[PDB]
Each structure stands twice: as C-alpha cells, then as structure tokens.
Write a protein that binds this ligand. Structure first.
Ligand SMILES: *[C@@H]1O[C@H](CO)[C@@H](O[C@@H]2O[C@H](CO)[C@@H](O[C@@H]3O[C@H](CO)[C@@H](O)[C@H](O)[C@@H]3O)[C@H](O)[C@H]2NC(C)=O)[C@H](O)[C@H]1NC(C)=O
Ligand SMILES: *[C@@H]1O[C@H](CO)[C@@H](O[C@@H]2O[C@H](CO)[C@@H](O[C@@H]3O[C@H](CO)[C@@H](O)[C@H](O)[C@@H]3O)[C@H](O)[C@H]2NC(C)=O)[C@H](O)[C@H]1NC(C)=O
Ligand SMILES: *[C@@H]1O[C@H](CO)[C@@H](O[C@@H]2O[C@H](CO)[C@@H](O[C@@H]3O[C@H](CO)[C@@H](O)[C@H](O)[C@@H]3O)[C@H](O)[C@H]2NC(C)=O)[C@H](O)[C@H]1NC(C)=O
Ligand SMILES: *[C@@H]1O[C@H](CO)[C@@H](O[C@@H]2O[C@H](CO)[C@@H](O)[C@H](O)[C@H]2NC(C)=O)[C@H](O)[C@H]1NC(C)=O
Ligand SMILES: *[C@@H]1O[C@H](CO)[C@@H](O[C@@H]2O[C@H](CO)[C@@H](O)[C@H](O)[C@H]2NC(C)=O)[C@H](O)[C@H]1NC(C)=O
Ligand SMILES: *[C@@H]1O[C@H](CO)[C@@H](O[C@@H]2O[C@H](CO)[C@@H](O)[C@H](O)[C@H]2NC(C)=O)[C@H](O)[C@H]1NC(C)=O
Lengths: 52, 224, 213, 175, 109, 175, 224, 175
C-alpha cells in the first residue's frame, strides 16, 4: 500500500514506539526487540483499591 | 543529551500549530517534559507538562482546552499542539526535559531545547522609510547624528543595515513599538563625524520580508 | 496558585563584586525552588535546583540559599559571562510559575546624554502625519525623563519611548522619543521642544526647532 | 504487602484523592477534605521514572540482521543459524518476562513502604496528643485547626503547645 | 468527637492489570505497556523509499531478466526487496545458479 | 533479617507448630497450645507457588539441536559453533545461579515481613491492655479466655471491653 | 489450561489403581492439585491434595493410609493411587488444579479434569429381561404404556433402547435400584398410541457388557 | 529510603564515627563519644562481601575466541558471525548495567534496614524509661552511667532496675 512507517515485517508494518514487539522475528529497519511474550506491562502506580 | 525542536512557523489566526521536541541517542525514555513560551520582551510562561509514567498531562488554566502535549508511546519525542492562534500567541516556545544529574526531577527544567518561533499574522503591511537629515542642530561635539524612520509595518521583524553593512559603528537600532493604530515603528540612527557629510553618502537598508518591501533611503546633508 | 516576585527587576554591578538577587513566593514552598539564566536570543539554562543544589556544568560562584518564602541567588564574584536576566521558578505545585525576571548589568561612570532633535521629513509631510524625534545617545544610568513641549505647552499622551540595550563596549544606553501628530495639528504650532533630564545634567537640557527650519 | 500498609492496616484507597499518590484526609471545625502529600508523591514520581528509564533507555532500537538463505548442501550452517536465532529469542523472552514480574513486585512494595513511612512520620510527631484509631487515622485529644493540620504534614507539629490541652481530655476519658 | 487526620493512598477508575512474582492480575492505578502487538497488514515504504516488489519472479529471474519480470526494468532505488513465496519464474531454462544464496545476501545490502 | 523478626526479636522457631508457617501460641485457664494463622499462611503459600511458577513455567523442555560435525577445512565454522555453544552455556549458567541466590534472599525476607506484619496486627489491637514482654509474646493485664484469644487472632479484639479490667491491674503494679 | 486424566478402569476388590492427571503446555508447574471423587448419584467428596512447594500431601482421614497423591518432581502430572478397592470405591474421580485468574489459589478448584470412572467388581451376573404387556388396563387417554423389566444384573451399566434406537419419544429408562439381595434392577417403559398394538411390534434392546448378555424381548399386545 | 531510617528519621551520618558502619553516640556524667555497634557492622560486612562474591566469583576470566576472517564469497557466514558477536555483547552489556543498578538499590535498603532494626532494639528495651526525642536519639528519665549504656547496646538493659527512678522523673514533668 501507500503508507510510510519505519519498521517493516513480512505480515505488515509496525510502530517503533515501544521497546518490544511480538509480531514477527524478521524485520528490516530500526525495530524493537522481538519476543514471544503476549503481555509485558510495567506497573508504575499503586494497587487500585477503590471503595470496597 | 540535546533537545532539538522543530523549525519556526507562521500561521494565520484560528488555525492550529504542532511543535516537536526530540532527544538524542535515547529512542525510549520516560522523562517528563514541560513546554514554556516567551512572548517578545516578556518573561517565561509555563504552559503545561506530561508525565509519561502516569500517562497524564497537566496544563496551566489559561491554556486548558486549547493545548495538547503528547508523546508517541515511550519515545523521547514530545509534541505540543496549540489551537485557535491569535496575535498574542506569537512567542518563542521552549521544550524542557525535567531531569538533572540526579535523574528525573519532575519540577526543574534541567535541559532545554533551542526554541521554536511561532508568529501569528493575517496581514503584511509594507513599511515606509523616512530620512532623518543630519542638520547642524543635530551636530554636537564634532559629530553629527542621522538616521532613518521605519513606519507602517506589520509584522516583525525588520532588519536595518547601514552602508550595506559597511557602517556598524554607532549604528543604533531602537526596538520596535506598538502604536495605538496597531502597527509597528522603529528608528535606526547612526553617529558620524561632521567632516563626512559631503564625501560619504549614507543610506539605510531596510528589509521587511512578510510584505516583501526592500527600500534604501538616502540621508540629505545638503542644507536648509 | 503561587506567585513569585523577584527584586530588584533590574540592577547594575561591576565585575567581581558580590551580587545579591532575591525571590519571594506567595506561600511557603520549602526548598522547591530553581534558578535560571537566559542570555538574549538564547534559551534559558538551569543553575540551581532544590534552592541550594547546583546543576552540573555551571561554575561554583553561583550559590543558592533560602527556605520557606524568601530565597536568594548569590553571585560571590561577578564575571562578564554572567550577564543575562535571572529567573526563579517554584516546583511546589501546579501550575509552575516563574518570576518576572531580574536583569544584571555592567556598572559604569555617569555619562551625560547627547540630545539631538530632528524635524519631520518633507516626504513625511506629504502623507498627512508628523513625527519629531528626540535622540538621547550614550548616557548612563538608564533612568531618564523626556518631556515634549509645543509652544511652551506640555504634551501628554502623544509620545512613545524606545531604549537600546547597554552597548557592549561603551556600556551606555540610548533612548529615542518620537512625538507623533497630524499635519493639520503640526501647522497650527511653531515651537517644538524636547526637554531631557538626567543625573549627569545639572539642569534639564532642551533642544528646540521651528516649523519652517 | 511487604510493609503491611497498602491492603494491610490501611484497607483501601481514596478515589476522591485525585491530585497525588499518597497523602492525608482531614476533618476539623474549619472543614475537611483530601490533600496530597507533595514530598512523598514528588520523590516517588522521580523514582518510578528512573526505574522505567533504567529498563528502556538501554533498549535502543537496532537494525535486525538479514534473514539468511541456505541451499541443500548447507544444512549444518542452516541449523547453526537456527540455533543462534532460537538461542537469543529464548533468553530475551524469558528474561524480559521475568524481569517485569520482579520489577512489578518491587514497585508495589515501594508504594507500600512510602505509605508506611508517611504514617510513621505522623505517628512519631503526635505521640500522646492523639489516639491511633486504626485504618491509618488519628483522633486528636485537642482541637487541631487548619494551621495545626499543616504542621503535622510538615514535620513541625509542636507537642508541648497542645500537650496541656490534650493531657486533660485524655485523662478525662481515662477516668 | 475529636478532629481526625488520616493517611491514605490514591485510587482511580483504572482496570489496568499487571502480573507480579507473588501475585497475578493485580489491578494498578497506573502502568506503562512495553509490548507492541499491532501491525497495519500492509507492506509500506521505509523512510520514504518504496520497496522493490519482484512480482511473480524470484531474485534469479529479476537479476537475469526473465520475460515475466518485464516491469522490473526502471529499478533505481528501494528500501528492501519483496519476494513472493509462489515466485516460480526465475531461471526458465533449466540449470543451476552458482552462489545464488550469496548473491541474494549481497543484494540485501 | 531485612525486617528484624525472624532470627531477630523472635529468636527461634516452633518445632511443635506443625500445621502452618506462622501463627500463635496461647496460654490461659482453659488451656494452651500452638495454633497456625490461616490467613497469613494461606496467602504466603499462594505467593511462593506463584514465585516458583514464575521461574519454571517458562522453562519448558526443548529439543536440543544436533551436535555438528566439521572437517579439517572447516575450523573457522567449527570455532564459531563452539563460540555459540559456549556463549549460551555461560549466560544460562551464570544467570540461573545468580537468579536463585537473589530469589532465595527475597523468599526469606518475605517470610520475615509476614511475621512482622502478623506481630504488628496483634500489637496494634491490644495497646495498653497487654504488656510487650519481648520474643514476640504479649502478657495480658486481664483474663483472656479462649473466646478472647480468637478475637485477637481475628482483628476483632474489643479494647474497651477489657479496658476497665486491664486498667486496674496495670496501675496496681504501676503503684 | 486443560487437565486430561487417564481412561476409565475396572479393578477387582483388594487391588490397587493409579490415575494420572496432566496439564497442557506447562512442562513444569508447582500448582497444588486436589482429587475429588463422586459416587453415583451422590455429592462431591474431597480425598486429598498435594502442595509441591512444601513437598507434602494432605489427605482426608477416611482415606489416610490407603491413598497416595504423588507428582513427578516439578512436572505438572499428578498421580492418585488408591489401594484395597471395594464396591463402595466405585465412583468418578476428578483432579483439579488449585488456581484461579489470581494465580495459585490453594483452596479453590479453578480448573477440573474430565473425570475417571473406576468400577470395582468381582462378579458379572447376566440380566433377565421380562416383558411388560400393554394390557387394556394400561391404556388411558388413547395411549397404551408398555415396557421391559431388567432384573438380576451386577454391575452397572445396562443400556436399554427401543426399536433398535428408532423409538426415542416416550422412552423412560428408570435409574437402577439396589435390592436387598445385592443386585440391580431397572424398568424401561415407553408410551405408544393405542392404534399401533397390531401394526408395529415393540422390542427392548438391553445390553450388559460385563456379563456379555445381549437380549431382545418382544412385548405381547395380543389379548388376555 | 525503603525503611525510612537513613536520610529519613535519622537525617544525616556521623563523620566522627570512623570505626564502624552503624552504632551509637552517648553522653552522660562519665563522658561522651561515638561507638560502633559490632554485631550489626560485623554481620553487614559479611553480607556485602557475600553479595560482591556472588556477582564476581562466577565471572572467571576466559580465553576470547579467535577473530574470524572471511572472504568475498563468505558474506552470509560473516554476517552470522557478526550477529553472534553483537548478540552476546548486547545481552551482557544490558544485563550487567541493569544488575548493578538493582543490586545497588538493595544494598542501600539493606543498610537502611540494619539501622532501623538497630533503632528498634534499643526502643524495645527502654520503653517508658526514656523519651524518644527524634533523630534516632533517646533521652533517659534516669541517670545512665557507662555500665548502663553498654547494657542497652547489649540487649540486657534492666527496665525494673531504673523503673522506680525513671517513673518519678517522668511524672514530675508530667505534672
Ligand atoms: C512518506 O514520506 C515521504 C517523505 O516525507 C513523503 O514524500 C514527501 O511528500 C511530501 C508531501 O506530499 C512532499 O514533501 C516535499 O518534498 C520536497 C522535496 O522532495 C520539498 O522541497 C518540499 O518542501 C516538501 O517537503 C514530497 O512529495 C515528498 N518529500 C520528500 C522529501 O520525500 C511521502 O508523501 C509519504 N507518503 C505517505 C503515504 O505518507
Ligand atoms: C476515568 O477517570 C479519568 C480521570 O483520570 C477520566 O478522564 C477525565 O474525563 C473528564 C471528563 O469526562 C475530564 O474532565 C474535564 O476536565 C477539564 C479540565 O481538566 C474541563 O475543562 C472539562 O470541562 C472536563 O471537566 C478530565 O480532564 C479527564 N481527566 C483525565 C486525567 O483524563 C475518565 O473519563 C474516566 N473514565 C470513565 C469515567 O470511564
Ligand atoms: C512463469 O511462471 C508461470 C507460473 O507462475 C509459468 O507457467 C507454467 O509454465 C510451465 C511451462 O509450460 C507449465 O508446466 C507445464 O504444465 C502442463 C500443464 O500443467 C504440464 O502438462 C507440463 O508437463 C508442464 O508441467 C506450468 O503448468 C505453468 N503453470 C503453473 C506452474 O502454474 C510460466 O511458464 C513462467 N514463465 C517463464 C518461466 O518464462
Ligand atoms: C551523573 O553525574 C555525572 C557527572 O556529574 C554526569 O555526567 C556529566 O553529564 C554532563 C551533561 O549532563 C556533562 O556535561 C559532563 O561532562 C558529564 N561528566 C561526566 C564525568 O560524565 C551524569 O550525566 C550524571 N548522571 C545522570 C543520569 O544524569
Ligand atoms: C501507529 O501509531 C498510530 C498513531 O501514532 C496509530 O494510528 C492511530 O490509532 C488510533 C488508535 O486509537 C486511531 O484513533 C487512529 O487510527 C490513529 N490516530 C492518530 C492520531 O494517529 C496506528 O494505528 C499505529 N499502527 C500500528 C500500531 O500498527
Ligand atoms: C489474568 O486474567 C486474564 C483475563 O481475565 C486471564 O486470561 C483468560 O484466561 C481464561 C482461561 O483461564 C480464558 O478463558 C480467557 O479468554 C482469558 N482472557 C484473556 C483476555 O486472556 C489469565 O489467565 C489470568 N492470568 C492467570 C495467571 O491466571
């Protein structure tokens, strides 16, 4: 298609806004590390305990 | 680290402007970044800031609902977008990473960008340059003063040079004023020796890019 | 909201003397205060944070002090590089607020202003307006009083002033006052005078001209 | 958790406290309301930003190497290439998952510690002049106006100033 | 009764969940994702320059000039080479391409 | 250790307490004996199981690649294969040893924290009605029957109910 | 995750039986696993559980010394072994991982296996199928009821079908009973229209696998 | 920090205390001065040595493999070699930096815990016989000579021995 991006993969094009990606091991360009994980979320706040 | 901002921009009132601010050799960062504007001749004014670890952006009340400070995921680039510009929005806009040698420092702007000049204007009026003749009344102490008067121009800036840049000693370019009519006017004056009114001719090279007006006015020593 | 008020708004000092700039906040902010320096045309740079801690890369002559509401940026010895407006900012709450700014300037010997009056140009009188320029050149200190007198009558609400920054070598100011009126009102009066009062002048010095000359 | 305050002796959070991570709720004659503690919140925001930075700043984007192609007489080096690709992937996948899990546990404990330290600072100040009523709340034996409340939130609270008052009310219910 | 001062912590409408070592699916007030899992499903042009699509040809057919690769003659610049899995044209005359794989790696740069 | 309870102000363990990790020993007119604290023990067992799971669940067994064979003219790729095998082995060997050491330290601290938190819950309840006699033990100033003991092990203990009693016995030895 | 148990088994009294319970895509796990049996028609009964992180197994008192719950190292497969079986041990046995979406949950069985039927028997007695003739006294409302009587069989199950599976409407297979003599007996009855006693012939296909007895008894409308 | 003592309720360090990491400063009729606490300092030195050992002992020096050379027809295996070298370097560089950062945070918390545990041991002993005056300092309600001071630094302090004295002085200012 007529789209730009900075990281290309065989199955599409992905954004490089995050340090990890799980879409495809094969990439060309400045790309994040490929991992097999389905979730990588760093906590920054507290445990959320609203009115109980 | 070095913050690099987008270039200067010109926008008409009522539009929207977006400014970028990128860091060097970082790719991914979570430092909070603040934006500060500076109107010509005034002090600093805090517009807002973004704290990536909490995913929110705080803004000054006078800009709330009109400015958005965004960042692309965890990338170091931070964007400031201002909507519905006016003439009072013409200023230099700075981005600043809120870090020190101690690490992230949420309230202090350790490293600043180069600034981004944004001028809002919907009318380009060309100036009129009028001579200031070095009369004998304008001669004192063996030196005679003379200059040119820049009038009827909007917007800034206008650059005045003497002898096509040859005369730089004694050249005094007074800062522009805002008259009641809503335009700008400044006077550029130089001091020259009295025994040069006949030999050396003096001109003032005045430029006004927005109106595309280039004028060169000669001073008239001659007589009365 | 917290308001920060610097004082003085401008000061003059020599090279090597101690410089003392103050900064006061509306409410107590502990030591959550920072200091900045901004050279003309250049982005501001951080000097002090936490009201005492010194940012890496700026010299030891800059020092911070104060806790609570009143704060003091102390320059032990003044150097030519340290010539810029200095601002204080609080980071105790949001929105963050700066001070109005304090400019630091080279101190020099008193200089009398050289007063030059300029009649309006002939090309000007063909448009319908009238501008008369009084030049105060190479004088110190900055404080000066310019009064426009037409036919020995004081003029009010018809003039504006423009001051030039302290020149790098002679360290003097330059002021230009422009008296703007209409051509119709220009031809009903004959005497046009500019009165200048300054420290270096024992008495106010007036330069005058007539309409025909 | 590890410090017993969050989801511990302070059972739940304050949805009505929107301007900070930790802080206080007060109630006296002048009024009531939640107020964020600037010092603890400000430092914690710096710490978490440093923690996130220390993980992602060194994870700079790189240029992925070319996917190699091998013929029918190159199976050994083809398998070696496959071993190399699989070896790196397993290490990064396992480490990144494990590191985030360990970091997240410390982040929650870090918030727990800051609440507990904040509670101890208030308790260390008030001493006999207030009664510990659980859930991180203090009931004063004396009247504490708005000015008095900020002194507790400052490390300045004057125990002798209210001691004579608080002593009488304390022994009144004690008798 | 008497005036009260309490100590407490923040809560919000966050359904964000993180996993820890001692507990799983913990709801937290704030979090940052690190993993990208979305693609646009299209082959785009990296850094402005468009890719070189070989069509029904493999690298051998393109570099040799197989008549089915006719449109691949204005080749001047590309970000990367695209080969389809079903590309079967290549060397129409039966034979062996010598060091074909090293040529492909050579052309990758 | 990191929280000062285990091998700290509670010097030793209870061999006679076989049904739990943490808990209490009581003694009154009705009887005595050790009793496990269900809530702390139950949560801790879940945490350690999660901790062990988070280490081993992603360590799935894999098929080891074929040991390559090279001839006399293939020393360079033979050494590259050796470099690859040695490189992976060093990383896994060093990381696994280091990770277990770090995890084990946190496991002991985790148990230390849970004991300290359990002790604080009891101390926060009893207040003046009991005397802290060290080694994690409380001596009541009032009679505490079996029903009273479980209230302390529940978070329900009624301080005013025994306050009038405990106050008299406290001031009796105080005078 | 999915727990998969070993297949159904038949054992004679006094023997020992071992049941496996494996998880999917795990290899290594430390989740505690409990085993629960269900006698036919009764409720659930907790037998025991194993807690790998402490390396022990707890059991209900009624099974102590007779059942062992084991796991191979840190593998997810958990084995339950019961010794000295009796007829009262005939039940469906379930394995359950003690985990939820919150992680390991030591006391609640979040994910269950498919069950493992274990029947203990040392005697296979073949049933006798006796007709239930649709008399006029068994005709009411235009429909006549008829069935077959299964008698003298041990053990379960026996499957009864009508018209070789063709007749499924109105077929009522009553659950088996335990008589004082120690055997089982059930009756399968169907309701048919009255104007079909002569045209359509009705049979009952009764199966008893343990005794290898397959019988097909015809009902006799005829007359008295 | 994580335990609130160092740079917390004990604001600063003791430059004049040169013979140990943690300890006490005393002042009585006999004299004054700083004295190191042997038990806490001795154990902490062992722990940090173990911590440094557990990081570096397994980092034995090794023989670096030969830098390979490849010709113009060996670009694929040249790139594979480059991928192998770059892959190992990134992992060790990222892990070593991250590990030191995480370890350093625990080292500071470890020192913080030891100070807090040391402070609690003294506080648990003195009880009503001394007044907590902040900054980790205790003011006695009785005279505590040099012999008495070491008993506090030992876990032996006799509360009843000075109780009758300290009780009178306490209630004297209390009245
Ligand atoms: C993908 O990104 C490329 C690169 O920016 C886009 O090409 C650019 O498109 C813009 C708008 O159509 C144009 O930019 C102009 O470039 C000339 C010099 O090339 C410059 O003198 C102008 O001032 C202006 O910047 C131009 O077509 C082209 N520019 C460049 C430098 O490549 C492309 O359109 C993007 N495609 C998509 C689908 O977003
Ligand atoms: C969950 O809570 C968040 C807050 O953290 C909600 O986002 C908030 O949405 C409200 C409107 O729904 C925003 O209020 C607006 O505030 C501005 C000034 O800040 C004011 O000018 C507007 O008139 C309006 O009152 C609020 O700013 C915004 N806050 C943030 C941090 O985004 C969110 O809507 C909630 N989600 C739900 C209820 O599903
Ligand atoms: C470019 O590629 C196309 C396919 O994408 C080639 O078409 C294929 O051409 C060959 C040569 O005739 C065909 O092979 C023959 O097929 C017939 C019928 O199946 C069979 O009887 C013969 O024994 C022989 O196998 C093939 O079928 C045909 N289509 C395919 C492969 O789908 C085309 O020839 C290529 N052009 C070149 C290389 O110049
Ligand atoms: C830690 O401190 C060092 C030294 O003060 C910082 O490194 C300096 O960084 C500034 C720019 O930020 C340079 O001008 C100096 O030349 C650097 N000095 C040295 C010795 O490297 C370092 O940036 C600080 N760390 C962080 C995370 O800010
Ligand atoms: C890459 O990022 C862009 C934005 O930087 C994504 O496009 C946005 O996606 C949002 C999702 O909420 C939509 O509203 C719009 O389609 C886009 N908005 C804006 C402002 O750009 C894009 O989807 C991303 N591509 C990925 C992840 O593959
Ligand atoms: C954390 O919660 C998620 C979502 O609730 C769990 O993922 C679900 O798992 C169940 C089966 O266990 C599936 O039926 C759902 O479709 C899943 N949903 C999603 C969004 O993935 C996850 O299993 C939980 N984590 C743990 C460790 O139990």
């Amino acid at each position: 298609h007529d789209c730009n991006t900075t990281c290309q993969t065989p199955k599409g094009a992905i954004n490089t806004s995050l340090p990890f990606q799980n879409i495809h091991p094969i990439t060309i360009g400045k790309c994040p590390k490929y991992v097999k994980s389905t979730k990588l979320r760093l906590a920054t706040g507290l445990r959320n305990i609203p009115s109980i | 680290v070095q913050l690099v901002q987008s270039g200067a921009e010109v926008k008409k009132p009522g539009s929207s402007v977006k400014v970028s601010c990128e860091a060097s050799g970082v790719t991914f960062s979570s430092y909070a970044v603040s934006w500060v504007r500076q109107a010509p001749g005034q002090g600093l004014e805090w517009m807002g800031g973004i704290i990536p670890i909490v995913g929110t952006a705080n803004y000054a009340q006078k800009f709330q609902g009109r400015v958005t400070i965004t960042a692309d995921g965890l990338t170091s680039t931070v964007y400031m977008e201002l909507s519905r510009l006016r003439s009072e929005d013409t200023a230099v806009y700075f981005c600043a990473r809120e870090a020190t040698w101690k690490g992230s420092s949420i309230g202090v702007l350790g490293i600043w960008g180069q600034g981004t000049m944004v001028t809002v204007s919907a009318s380009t009026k060309g100036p009129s340059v009028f001579p200031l003749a070095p009369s004998s009344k304008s001669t004192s102490g063996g030196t005679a003063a003379l200059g040119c008067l820049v009038k009827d121009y909007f917007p800034e800036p206008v650059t005045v040079s003497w002898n096509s840049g040859a005369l730089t000693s004694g050249v005094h370019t007074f800062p522009a004023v805002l008259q009641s009519s809503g335009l700008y006017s400044l006077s550029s004056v130089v001091t020259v020796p009295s025994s040069s009114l006949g030999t050396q001719t003096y001109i003032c090279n005045v430029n006004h890019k927005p109106s595309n007006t280039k004028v060169d006015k000669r001073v008239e020593p001659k007589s009365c | 909201d917290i308001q920060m008020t610097q004082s003085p708004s401008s000061l003059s000092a020599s090279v090597g003397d101690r410089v003392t700039i103050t900064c006061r906040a509306s409410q107590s902010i502990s030591d959550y205060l920072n200091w900045y320096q901004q050279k003309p045309g250049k982005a501001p740079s951080l000097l002090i944070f936490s009201a005492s801690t010194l940012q890496s890369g700026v010299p030891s002559r800059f020092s911070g002090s104060g806790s609570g509401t009143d704060f003091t940026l102390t320059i032990s010895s003044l150097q030519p590089e340290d010539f810029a407006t200095y601002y204080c900012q609080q980071n105790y709450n949001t929105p963050r607020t700066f001070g109005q700014g304090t400019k630091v300037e080279i101190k020099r010997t008193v200089a009398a202003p050289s007063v030059f009056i300029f009649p309006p140009s002939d090309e000007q009188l063909k448009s319908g307006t009238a501008s008369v320029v009084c030049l105060l050149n190479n004088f110190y200190p900055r404080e000066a009083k310019v009064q426009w007198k037409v036919d020995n009558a004081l003029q009010s609400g018809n003039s504006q002033e423009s001051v030039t920054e302290q020149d790098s070598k002679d360290s003097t100011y330059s002021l230009s006052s422009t008296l703007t009126l209409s051509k119709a009102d220009y031809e009903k009066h004959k005497v046009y005078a500019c009165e200048v009062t300054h420290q270096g002048l024992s008495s106010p010095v007036t330069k005058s001209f007539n309409r025909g000359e | 958790g590890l410090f017993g305050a969050i989801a511990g002796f302070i059972e739940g959070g304050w949805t009505g406290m929107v301007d900070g991570w930790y802080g206080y709720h007060h109630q006296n004659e002048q009024g009531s309301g939640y107020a964020a503690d600037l010092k603890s919140t400000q430092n914690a925001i710096d710490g978490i930003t440093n923690k996130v930075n220390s993980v992602i700043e060194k994870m700079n984007t790189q240029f992925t190497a070319v996917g190699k192609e091998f013929n029918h007489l190159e199976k050994r080096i083809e398998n070696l290439n496959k071993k190399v690709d699989d070896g790196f992937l397993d290490i990064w996948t396992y480490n990144a998952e494990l590191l985030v899990l360990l970091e997240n546990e410390r982040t929650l404990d870090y918030h727990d510690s800051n609440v507990k330290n904040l509670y101890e600072k208030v308790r260390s100040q008030l001493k006999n002049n207030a009664k510990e009523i659980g859930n991180g709340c203090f009931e004063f034996y004396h009247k504490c106006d708005n000015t008095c409340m900020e002194s507790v939130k400052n490390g300045t609270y004057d125990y002798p100033k209210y001691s004579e008052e608080a002593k009488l009310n304390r022994e009144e219910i004690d008798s | 009764p008497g005036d009260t001062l309490c100590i407490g912590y923040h809560a919000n409408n966050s359904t964000d969940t993180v996993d820890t070592v001692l507990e799983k699916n913990v709801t937290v007030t704030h979090s940052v994702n690190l993993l990208e899992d979305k693609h646009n499903g299209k082959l785009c042009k990296l850094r402005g320059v468009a890719p070189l699509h070989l069509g029904k040809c493999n690298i051998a057919g393109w570099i040799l000039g197989n008549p089915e690769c006719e449109s691949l003659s204005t080749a001047s610049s590309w970000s990367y080479i695209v080969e389809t899995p079903s590309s079967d044209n290549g060397t129409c005359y039966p034979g062996d391409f010598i060091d074909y794989e090293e040529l492909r790696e050579q052309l990758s740069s």
